[PDB]
Design a protein around this motif. Sequence first.
Motif, short mmCIF file in Angstrom:
data_model
loop_
_atom_site.label_atom_id
_atom_site.label_comp_id
_atom_site.label_asym_id
_atom_site.label_seq_id
_atom_site.Cartn_x
_atom_site.Cartn_y
_atom_site.Cartn_z
N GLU A 131 9.65 3.90 8.93
CA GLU A 131 9.30 5.05 9.74
C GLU A 131 8.24 5.90 9.04
O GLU A 131 8.27 6.09 7.82
CB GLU A 131 10.54 5.90 10.03
N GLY A 132 7.31 6.43 9.83
CA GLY A 132 6.21 7.21 9.31
C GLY A 132 4.97 6.42 8.97
O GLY A 132 3.95 7.01 8.60
N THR A 133 5.02 5.09 9.09
CA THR A 133 3.87 4.23 8.83
C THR A 133 3.50 3.50 10.11
O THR A 133 4.21 3.56 11.12
CB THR A 133 4.17 3.22 7.72
N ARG A 134 2.36 2.81 10.08
CA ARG A 134 1.99 1.96 11.21
C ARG A 134 2.84 0.70 11.24
O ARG A 134 3.25 0.24 12.32
CB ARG A 134 0.50 1.62 11.15
N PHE A 135 3.16 0.16 10.06
CA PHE A 135 3.91 -1.09 9.95
C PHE A 135 5.25 -0.94 10.65
O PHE A 135 5.87 -1.94 11.04
CB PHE A 135 4.12 -1.47 8.48
N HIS A 136 5.68 0.32 10.83
CA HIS A 136 6.88 0.62 11.60
C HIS A 136 6.94 -0.21 12.87
O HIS A 136 7.91 -0.94 13.10
CB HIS A 136 6.92 2.10 11.94
N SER A 163 0.81 -1.21 0.00
CA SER A 163 0.00 0.00 0.00
C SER A 163 0.85 1.26 0.00
O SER A 163 0.30 2.35 -0.23
CB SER A 163 -0.95 0.01 1.20
N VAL A 179 9.75 -3.03 13.64
CA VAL A 179 10.78 -3.10 14.67
C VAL A 179 10.60 -4.37 15.47
O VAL A 179 11.58 -5.05 15.79
CB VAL A 179 10.79 -1.84 15.56
N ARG A 202 3.95 6.18 -3.53
CA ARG A 202 3.91 7.21 -2.50
C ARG A 202 5.28 7.85 -2.38
O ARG A 202 6.30 7.28 -2.79
CB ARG A 202 3.48 6.64 -1.14
N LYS A 203 5.30 9.05 -1.81
CA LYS A 203 6.56 9.76 -1.61
C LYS A 203 7.44 9.00 -0.64
O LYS A 203 6.99 8.61 0.45
CB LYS A 203 6.28 11.18 -1.10
N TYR A 239 12.89 0.14 8.75
CA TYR A 239 11.92 0.04 9.83
C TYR A 239 10.59 0.68 9.47
O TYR A 239 9.68 0.68 10.30
CB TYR A 239 12.48 0.69 11.10
#
Lengths: 136, 136, 136, 136, 136, 136
Positions: B29-34, B10, B38, B14-15, B27
């Motif tokens: 970063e900036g997403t929920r999957f982050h 998804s 981790v 995207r940028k 990791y």
Amino acid sequence: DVVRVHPDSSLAGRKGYSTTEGALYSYLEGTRFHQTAVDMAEIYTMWPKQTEANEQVCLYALGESIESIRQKCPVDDADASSPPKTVPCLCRYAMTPERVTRLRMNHVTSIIVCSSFPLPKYKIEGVQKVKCSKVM
Amino acid sequence: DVVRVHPDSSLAGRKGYSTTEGALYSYLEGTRFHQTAVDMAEIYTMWPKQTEANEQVCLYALGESIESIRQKCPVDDADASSPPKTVPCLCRYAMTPERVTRLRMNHVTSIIVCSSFPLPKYKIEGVQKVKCSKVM
Amino acid sequence: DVVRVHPDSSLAGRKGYSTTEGALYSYLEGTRFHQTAVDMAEIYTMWPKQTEANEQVCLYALGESIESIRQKCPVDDADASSPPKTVPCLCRYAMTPERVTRLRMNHVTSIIVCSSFPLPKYKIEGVQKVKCSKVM
Amino acid sequence: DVVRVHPDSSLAGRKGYSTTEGALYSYLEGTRFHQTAVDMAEIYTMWPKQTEANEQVCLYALGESIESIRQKCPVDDADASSPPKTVPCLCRYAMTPERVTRLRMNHVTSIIVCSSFPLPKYKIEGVQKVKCSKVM
Amino acid sequence: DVVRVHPDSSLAGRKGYSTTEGALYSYLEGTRFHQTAVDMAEIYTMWPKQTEANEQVCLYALGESIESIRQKCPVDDADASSPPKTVPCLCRYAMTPERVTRLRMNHVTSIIVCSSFPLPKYKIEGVQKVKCSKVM
Amino acid sequence: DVVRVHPDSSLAGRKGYSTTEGALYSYLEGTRFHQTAVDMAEIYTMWPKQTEANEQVCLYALGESIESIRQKCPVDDADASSPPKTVPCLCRYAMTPERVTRLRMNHVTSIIVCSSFPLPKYKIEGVQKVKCSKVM
Ligand SMILES: [Zn+2]
Ligand SMILES: [Zn+2]
Ligand SMILES: [Zn+2]
Ligand SMILES: [Zn+2]
Ligand SMILES: [Zn+2]
Ligand SMILES: [Zn+2]
């Protein structure tokens, strides 16, 4: 002399602070992080070896009072504190005095610490160790 | 630097994310999957060999808490976690942090894992091993 | 003869005071800090060694009366006081008579002291020891 | 400037709105649909590709809260929202902000969506895809 | 000299204010918005970069006190404030001092901000970003 | 010789005072502001550098007594006072002796000071720094 700060620092693009050059150690005089900075500096004197000093710094970021940190020191020797690193590393998890101040303000119950911030090989509650994406 | 993601991700288009090029480890970063990322990274440190680490990751996808995963580790050694592979393979069963997040959200009782995700040769409950259609 | 003062001194750019040259010791006659100066000078005679003399000076800055300082002296010997250093160091924490006067006026409950002001190796209440950024 | 509206729009034959000419994009300021409009606009930014953005819009029409729509976005990036199309097509199933407002008011459990509103090729609960009788 | 104001400004058609010509920057002396204006000006000095300065301005419009805004500034440097833009843009969401005054009077819990008012790419509570219909 | 006064001065259009020409420095003899003028002049001698002299002038405008201002001077040196500027600048915030007199009469708790009145870079209570619209 300009004080070098993290690229994500709120002091970036300000008078006396720079991202590409400047002093790598500072108590951050004139800012609020100053207080946190000196506290961190004192921690780095209480524990001479970087590992448990960084453990105490991580506990400091988790909201634990600096008075208890002074209590936990095995000795009562007090030497002058060297300024903490303003740019320990270049990733988003750099344990700068500014980041510690922000974490203490947010009262976070867990923090993420990169590998440029050496920690004890055993588990620390509320601390998650990740690889440092880019170092100093 | 752009982070390479799965074609079915998804985060595609995207940028900061791309399908044909970018960093293969992140990791996220900036997403929920982050968070999942981790956690998976920590798993890959708890079990140094990929086989039982992937078994623990599969159990993580089946809804088992990360705290129990930490409990199951034979030792208390804690080393810094390397970022998990954002594109372990190119099929629809790639065990990306995003896919693990989706499976945990759906609370699936069974998952299908391709051959690019090496698993123990014995049966794992709720895991079905299939050939990876196309690899990285 | 001009009296050398700190760069941050309020006496800078005044008749009889200079930043780049002048006398390094003075009772600061003609100013208010004069009183503090002579008091500090008396302290430096009561305790011949610089360490506990500086400890008493720090306690003086924290608002403790000079009469109690005289009381705390082990002996009743009274020798002539030498003028205190107008520029002990060049950082912002220089323990000049002017800075001590300012701290006493502000009635501060805690002070920051640089490493150019040698203190006892044990903890002093209300005093935080930091590295001196630049020395004389 | 007049804002072009659907022939079946309740804004037809009103000051500032027209059926045969006008602006094809608008937040519909001065109407209630305005709120829905901006919400739809925000959706179209959360999902850059039109297919899953339209899927989220369809779910929005089915009564799902916009807060959950914000939650479902993979990233936290927030860019300015472009005004939604006031006339995506000319049939009776045009997914205008007005039609979405009407469907949300009626709390419909199923909607009919024309082919001018591209949707994911898989089934969506409560959505029936039909051919668009006439397009823009 | 006449001060240029927004077409929707309540100062339009008044002595000293005009819509088609005039000064584009003003503290709006003689009006109530004056106070808001200078406050906004001070904000634009506290945060040199326009993005987080506009974030603080948006928080100011949401009713947050200017004293807390001063508190949130990383440094204590205080430079003279430049007059804020009286016409940042020409749409209805222009963040003029007059509009900020009106929003603070209405004690709105949410505001709509156009794209001519650059904001941080992350979400801000109570702020909805829309495209600016027409710019200066 | 005519004494040049501010365009907004109450001495404008009076015998001995003019707006377009005249003396730029005066103690304003024959007026009430005379007293304030000489007081301000004395301040400008107590603090030779314009920055903290203007800070003391701002504190004087906020109602603080001139006796305390004399007390705050580091030295007891007293030199003849030069007449203060009757027109430091041409905006409405010009810190003329007349404006200081008016502010002291009104017992204002906060003042607005333009950039033509240089002040210390740190915050001063009750003083708001704005850009000077037009200078001398
Ligand atoms: Zn790092
Ligand atoms: Zn595969
Ligand atoms: Zn020093
Ligand atoms: Zn249609
Ligand atoms: Zn706009
Ligand atoms: Zn001015």
